[PDB]
Amino acid sequence: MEYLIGIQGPDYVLVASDRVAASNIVQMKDDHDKMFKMSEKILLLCVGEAGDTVQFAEYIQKNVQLYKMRNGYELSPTAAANFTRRNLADCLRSRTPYHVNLLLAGYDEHEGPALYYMDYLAALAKAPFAAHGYGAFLTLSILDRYYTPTISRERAVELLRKCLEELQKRFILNLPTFSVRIIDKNGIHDLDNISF
Amino acid sequence: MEYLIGIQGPDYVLVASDRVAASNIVQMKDDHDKMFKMSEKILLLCVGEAGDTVQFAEYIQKNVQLYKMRNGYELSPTAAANFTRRNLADCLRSRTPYHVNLLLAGYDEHEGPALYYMDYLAALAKAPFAAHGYGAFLTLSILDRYYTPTISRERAVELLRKCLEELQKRFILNLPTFSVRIIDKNGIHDLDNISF
Amino acid sequence: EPGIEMLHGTTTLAFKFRHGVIVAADSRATAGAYIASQTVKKVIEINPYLLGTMAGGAADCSFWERLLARQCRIYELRNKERISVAAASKLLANMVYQYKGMGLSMGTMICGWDKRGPGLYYVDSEGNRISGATFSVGSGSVYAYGVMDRGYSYDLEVEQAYDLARRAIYQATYRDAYSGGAVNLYHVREDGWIRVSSDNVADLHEKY
Amino acid sequence: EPGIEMLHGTTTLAFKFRHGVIVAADSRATAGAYIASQTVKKVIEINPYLLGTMAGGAADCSFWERLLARQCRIYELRNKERISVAAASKLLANMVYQYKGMGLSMGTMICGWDKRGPGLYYVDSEGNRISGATFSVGSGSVYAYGVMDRGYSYDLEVEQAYDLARRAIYQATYRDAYSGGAVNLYHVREDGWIRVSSDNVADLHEKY
Amino acid sequence: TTIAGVVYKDGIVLGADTRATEGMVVADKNCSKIHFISPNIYCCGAGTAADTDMTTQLISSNLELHSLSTGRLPRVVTANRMLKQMLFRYQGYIGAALVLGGVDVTGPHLYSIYPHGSTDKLPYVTMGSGSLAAMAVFEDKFRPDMEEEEAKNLVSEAIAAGIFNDLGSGSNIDLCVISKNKLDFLRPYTVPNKKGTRLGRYRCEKGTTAVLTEKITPLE
Amino acid sequence: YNGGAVMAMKGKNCVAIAADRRFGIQAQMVTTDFQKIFPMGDRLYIGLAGLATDVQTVAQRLKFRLNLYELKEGRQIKPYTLMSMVANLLYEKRFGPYYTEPVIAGLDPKTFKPFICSLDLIGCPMVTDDFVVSGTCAEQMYGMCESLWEPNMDPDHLFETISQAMLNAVDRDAVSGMGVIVHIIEKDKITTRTLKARMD
Amino acid sequence: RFSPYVFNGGTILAIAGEDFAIVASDTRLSEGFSIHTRDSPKCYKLTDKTVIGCSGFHGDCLTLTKIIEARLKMYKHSNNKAMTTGAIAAMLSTILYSRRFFPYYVYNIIGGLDEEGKGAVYSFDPVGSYQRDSFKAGGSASAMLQPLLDNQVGFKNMQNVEHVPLSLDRAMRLVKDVFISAAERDVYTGDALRICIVTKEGIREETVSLRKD
Amino acid sequence: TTIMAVQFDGGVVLGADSRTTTGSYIANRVTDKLTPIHDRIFCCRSGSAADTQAVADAVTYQLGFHSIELNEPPLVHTAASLFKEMCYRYREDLMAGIIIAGWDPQEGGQVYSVPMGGMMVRQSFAIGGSGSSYIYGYVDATYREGMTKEECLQFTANALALAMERDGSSGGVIRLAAIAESGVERQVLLGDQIPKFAVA
Amino acid sequence: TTIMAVQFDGGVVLGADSRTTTGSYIANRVTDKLTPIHDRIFCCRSGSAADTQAVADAVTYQLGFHSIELNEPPLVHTAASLFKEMCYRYREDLMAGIIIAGWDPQEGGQVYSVPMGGMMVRQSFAIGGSGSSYIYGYVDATYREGMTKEECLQFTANALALAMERDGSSGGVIRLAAIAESGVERQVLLGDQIPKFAVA
Amino acid sequence: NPMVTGTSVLGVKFEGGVVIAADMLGSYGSLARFRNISRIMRVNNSTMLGASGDYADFQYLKQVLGQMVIDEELLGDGHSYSPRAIHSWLTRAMYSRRSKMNPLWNTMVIGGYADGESFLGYVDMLGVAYEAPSLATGYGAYLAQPLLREVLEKQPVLSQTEARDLVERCMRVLYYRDARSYNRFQIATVTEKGVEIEGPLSTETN
């Protein structure tokens, strides 16, 4: 019922998320930052039934930063994606969920940007752009409509703005704020929170 | 779901409704009136299961208009209230889906304004103020704290605006626009909707 | 399936810019996982005054709208003048209000340009009957709503409206696994709807 | 009640203006249609560094905060520095997550003034460990949200905050049948917290 | 509820309790006394008390008018058949439990009506919750052709055993003796339980409770 | 479900009756001025408890039928007559059961004799000389009466005892309460008083 | 659904005074619609200053009332001291919790004296939540009892009346009256009334008869 | 619930126990499990009391008008058919224990039989109810052709006694009926008299 | 499945039908339900063959080991005890009823009738399987004392055949065994040799 | 899912000891299967045991008891498991296997006469334990227990003869009105002399 989105460009990935945490008719928090800094160049988008989301994200962050610490260098984004997929697939039996829908986004020095998709059944698939949650239905069409394999950063930002204002126009849920960050060779850049 | 609210002043009744209908996640009409014109001084607020609400409301519409034209004079708001209560309670035992929660408001030249709360169990109840829908949960407290039995139209509108702002602050659903009408000695008065 | 699922709804479309209403829909009966047909016209020529739409259930939509056609021609005879859009919506809604909770799965939109001008109402199985400026129903209705909301403009020129309809229908069928087939465009101009064309998504992909 | 008569609590609240956080909760315990007690201390006193709330299950919350108090005091004795509010919240979250979906009905929310400031974290049965500023939990917490939102201000004053909390929970219990009895209030100032007052709802009604 | 009846030498001596139990809470300490309809056909019942009562009224009416048409006193078997066929077709529905007894030209009679319509002519039956204990008492101490006082006693301990050895039964013991000539209002025959003395002396003081609005309406 | 409670005790030519004022949808109060006691005669009242729809239905239908009876016979109805009357009305709708448990308090139109009675939800009177209760908090309310009653109560003490009983009881029920109304029917005049109840 | 674990009724009632502690209960053991016996006390003596009452699934009543004594004995062997009231309360709360997901279908009341000899009553729920109280009635008839106790002792809805501290005699009279009254409306209660009184001079227990039905 | 009937030359012999159970408790231990439908036509209702008793009585109602109309003794086959369709129509709600046995002027003695649900057999002997399952072997091994009335009685008593010993849902005393030219001979073997085929 | 065993003077006589069902189908019609447990101890299975014959093999294994270690032929009561425990539902998914009977020097023939669930009771004769219900009465009528081998065999065959006719779970031929001190005498009864009985 | 049950066990204290009884009957549902099995057993020279409900479980109880009893006799100190101890031990077993949801489908009666004092104890499916002057299980509780308490109310103490007569009269009633009851039953009795289970007695037709 939440909303994620990622867009892959020539040398950057722009991702965005909602900041609403609700358990009932009422939302309890309007600043929920649900994006986990995997490393200096990798972000993890986590959504699903809450409680397990935070724990699985912390486990992955733990062990990835552990890898980087034990090994000098840092994991390639493909490695992180496959690692998370394996964890989720293997654990799909015993602890009956982790029930988390993921979007792993990252950019490395020489293999370029990347963006990986995960449902709670742990199905990994690279894609130029994707989304999650009920809102994704109203959005993937727009992403198809105004996306090209090459897109300037500002054009990607305004496309995202178009998508989010469409969400507010048409979706039934209330999403008055939207975190957004961008990944390139210069680490990870916070961006202007999209508010109304 | 939806949300209705009624506030009765010393000499008037003020009503307000949200203006969005849903199918699953979508809001097909953003300019939807859920509030019907019973007769010259009686307004009816309806909500509940899709389909049943409009049918029952217009059934009462034809009944009350037929009454007025048969008699020439006007049906008292209390009389129409009891009439709706009966026409709703009888169908309870022979209409399984008939969910209509109501707030019948209106003015009488004799006893001043009168607002009636109406659960779909057809349990009529006088109220100095009331509300239906989920947002009533979040809002009835605010409506209680800043209420006095005597309130001029200005403070009533401001209290209602406070209520709606509280919804937009906390409620998880998206209700951007609300229709507002007031009933007094001089018929009903349309008031500008509450946009954000 | 013991013979009764009939649909679940695929990617309708309708809006009412200032040169009348245009409607659009695809053609892909989805018998569970297997396509029943690629050439199921979903726009229904109720009369040279008014257009329906099939969605949610094939047989129920077709039958009840044909019955509506009977009823409205009876109306036009008895009153000697054409029935209004709102009246037709009322008739359909009242007809379908009974048989509530018996498995009906209608999702029609009544479209026409009556004396009040453009007429567009959403009529479904469970009794919703609402007018509006923008609509689409079916599985791909969400994608359709996306593209439509980003294309719509009451002052949009006619040919660009055609382009909008084609783009929306194409994107929706491109994402949906259950919507497909050839796109149909019907313009309800001044009195008497006019068929636009029936183009194919495969060719559209080349055009796009 | 073949084997189930769990006591529980409802309508807790808190907010964290500049002078530190305040805990105010009611004390009505219901077991169906039967209020079991009147003054159950729905503010669990973990230690004179932290405070805790109780809702959903009185026994569950009681014991789990008790055991966290054990863990916290152990942390003090080992590290000889006071634990952080964040650390306590995360510890409880891990401790409760295991036993996932085993019927745990915890709805607590930790508060305290640690060395980075005054903090307030929500911890529920299903692992929601969310920070915040103005929180309230329980069956009758919706009204608390309403009134508190209308009263909250990060620059609010001490007696102003006291009246805010009192009035808010009073409205809440006045609307919720499952909430009542005397209201208990707790103030968390700079390290070491005080008890403001705990008065009865009927007195509040006479006041208003 | 625990009701029983026997056919002694010259009539029937019905027995019943007066503990109405709404759920596990005593509805009435002196439950609406279980004896019933027009003379020489008194019956007692149990189960869904309401329907027992109103069925008895219905059959009472329908049979009284019959007798008035006849000019002759009604027969037990008549009421028996009526109760059969009515506690029938509403089968799979509420129904009731009944003990029907009376002394017509054919002497005493005693049938035990059941919800679906199971009936049977017996010298002794027990129905209700404590029917088991009452039947035990009977089968222990019943010998054919008891005397009037002997039968009254027998039913007294029969009901008492149910009273002291059941949860849903126990109050004033009620006896209902119908003979070819006579009829007794033993209402109630014997009470084993007396409410304990109230050691408290509360004597509710005036002005105990504050009053908001005092509205007075003189009538006469 | 909606909740509420009613009660009546007899006395020295004086009967008392009381019911709460809370109207709430199964968790949440709607208002505190809901009507549960209804006048059926000069000195005859009925108090209802249960589904508010059945309360306001049985009350109106009884008004109907009793008014018809009054106009027919031309005489004020006997309390026992009304008792049997309502004993029927619930029963015709046997397999539609009106979810309510009415109680009756009244006096003899010829002697002003004390009288109370209650009904099961399908009609099975408990013609009691002391008290009846109904609604959700029946057991607490029984408990209060079972001690607080006393024989031959003068009206002021009767009012005080009913007040204390209901205020002790409904205070202990979650879904009922929030105001208590009381009526005292004596040989001549009627007193209706409202009580300072915990409004929580 | 409804468990395979029969309900055995009973009623427990306890008031803490200024130096005494009333613990009293009906002694009737019942299931369904039959009484097992008439001489099953539901109050058990633990220390010279603490007495337990337990009611509910009578099997669990026995297991608890004889598992606790083991804890007392071993705590005495490990600490050379008879544990105080609060110790008993915390112990009972934990041991009740220990069977969280298959709980003891029991309601339990602790009556005793504190360090200062003031009256003390601790009331519990099946899982283990507990809180100190001046008085409480627990069990089948708890609904019929407790509000009357609230009125009489806590002076709720009492206005313009002094709060007379509870004397031993008045407490005993009140308990006897409330139990004889409860025997009227609750069926599970009857056949006797056992009362345990905890005083600094030890424990003396009294019994009276009720409606044998 | 061990009804059984045997046909012999010129007459029939019936037999059933006297125990109506409510599960594991006996409501009546002297139940008159033999219903005389007419002067010389008996039956044995079994399977549940009310649905069988009422149907049997209704069949007595019918066929009585029908025999007065024909002004001839009722034919056994006629009773069989009537009480066949009367069951068959309501074969979806009724249980039944029809083993109709009786004598007629024309065709000697008959034992028509059928369990609940309706159908027709004119066999030599009929067994129905609980204990029939247990008594099948004994009856099959013992029944012969042409056995007269006295050994029919002894055979019936023995079979019912075996059922009595092995069944737990049937018991009490053994009621017997010997229908023949002159009339019915209803007798009640009980206690010592019933066959004692000891266990060893 | 109509296993039934009888003790005679000097040994026991077993006996069992030969039919295995899988619904309305005859899985096997020559099923040999007698199982050699030892040199002079057999058993008879009934229902859920797999969960029986596995028990049979396991118990015969344990008996063989016990016999070779004690160095003397096992007592019948011994083998009576190795079913009783593992048929006391140590597995409890063992719907199975086995009547074991053999001969020892110490107490001659013995017959035990370990039922469903785990009991272990000695009887002069025992019956098992589905068809038992149809012959309990017959065997209670016919069995006596002091029967010899020939008449015991005729008894066994008669009872088995009587079960054979009625129960749908009994078909094919009749198997028999005559355990005695001298030796074993297995025999199979087929075709005309099954005792017939005149049909109705 | 109890396979084969017994009906009921009756037993009443008396001056000098405790007398209990039960009937030989094995029921596979409404089928009366086994008609000579003993459902009462002599624990030791001072204690018996009566059993209702399932029988196989009763046989397993006989196993464990007859092992523990011998285990005690071998020690040869002089101490014996008093009937109170046996009752207490049955309760804990009933828990130890009910606590893990695998109960013993039984209702157990202990009757003993230790140190000149009689003692009667009831144990059931769920480990509900207590002591009472007269006990009855199953439909026995609904039928004979009322008669026993009725008579014991007026007379506090019974001699052996009168208590035994009470026993057979209640057993006659139970045979009359209980479906799962057999015509024949033992009666057991303990005194200072020893436990003396006697007779395949029967309710001779009256």
Side-chain angles (χ1 to χ4, degrees), chain B residues 129 136-146 161-163 165-166 169-170, chain D residues 134-135 141-151 167 170-172 174-175:
Chain B
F129 63 100
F137 281 121
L138 294 174
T139 61
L140 186 55
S141 66
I142 303 104
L143 183 60
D144 179 290
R145 168 58 180 86
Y146 292 163
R161 178 232 64 90
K162 292 177 71 68
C163 187
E165 171 47 43
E166 190 277 331
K169 165 44 171 303
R170 278 280 192 221
Chain D
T134 63
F135 274 40
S141 71
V142 290
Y143 320 100
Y145 291 163
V147 182
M148 165 197 309
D149 281 305
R150 309 307 317 172
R167 163 68 78 175
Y170 173 89
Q171 313 306 85
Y174 178 85
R175 284 291 161 183

Side-chain angles (χ1 to χ4, degrees), chain A residues 25 27 169 171-172 174, chain B residues 25 27 169-172 174:
Chain A
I25 62 170
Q27 83 181 345
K169 268 185 46 49
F171 194 15
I172 186 55
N174 188 359
Chain B
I25 60 172
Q27 55 181 54
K169 165 44 171 303
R170 278 280 192 221
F171 194 48
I172 194 55
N174 188 354

Side-chain angles (χ1 to χ4, degrees), chain H residues 53-63 86:
Chain H
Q53 299 217 310
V55 171
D57 189 358
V59 177
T60 299
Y61 177 32
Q62 295 298 109
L63 182 148
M86 182 95 97

Side-chain angles (χ1 to χ4, degrees), chain A residues 129 134 136-142 144-146 162-163 165-166 169-170, chain C residues 134 139 141-151 167 171-172 174-175:
Chain A
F129 64 91
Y134 281 139
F137 296 92
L138 308 185
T139 62
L140 266 70
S141 66
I142 305 310
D144 276 326
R145 181 66 180 87
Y146 310 99
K162 196 193 256 192
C163 195
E165 52 87 15
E166 198 285 330
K169 268 185 46 49
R170 191 57 90 194
Chain C
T134 61
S139 63
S141 67
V142 289
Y143 316 99
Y145 264 63
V147 182
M148 183 177 177
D149 285 315
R150 299 309 310 171
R167 265 283 185 206
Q171 299 297 336
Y174 170 80
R175 278 275 161 195

Side-chain angles (χ1 to χ4, degrees), chain G residues 38-97:
Chain G
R38 309 178 192 267
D39 175 49
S40 288
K42 291 174 175 332
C43 347
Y44 305 77
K45 193 265 190 185
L46 282 71
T47 74
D48 279 17
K49 53 204 292 212
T50 60
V51 167
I52 183 61
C54 182
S55 65
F57 177 78
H58 194 63
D60 277 331
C61 295
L62 277 296
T63 308
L64 269 295
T65 185
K66 68 185 291 293
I67 189 66
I68 300 297
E69 291 265 340
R71 303 302 291 286
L72 273 71
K73 295 178 184 293
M74 65 180 288
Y75 177 103
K76 186 48 165 294
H77 292 110
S78 67
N79 293 23
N80 297 115
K81 186 266 299 175
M83 65 184 73
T84 72
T85 314
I88 292 287
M91 182 56 258
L92 181 63
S93 183
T94 64
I95 193 66
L96 284 156
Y97 189 15

Side-chain angles (χ1 to χ4, degrees), chain D residues 176-194:
Chain D
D176 182 357
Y178 276 140
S179 301
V183 62
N184 298 258
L185 198 152
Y186 282 78
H187 192 150
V188 181
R189 296 169 313 104
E190 183 66 25
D191 180 278
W193 50 264
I194 62 170

Side-chain angles (χ1 to χ4, degrees), chain E residues 29 198 204 209 212 214 217, chain F residues 146-147 149 164 190 193:
Chain E
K29 297 178 183 179
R198 176 193 292 179
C204 65
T209 315
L212 272 71
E214 199 156 50
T217 315
Chain F
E146 162 51 41
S147 161
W149 195 79
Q164 291 313 139
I190 306 302
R193 273 83 67 81

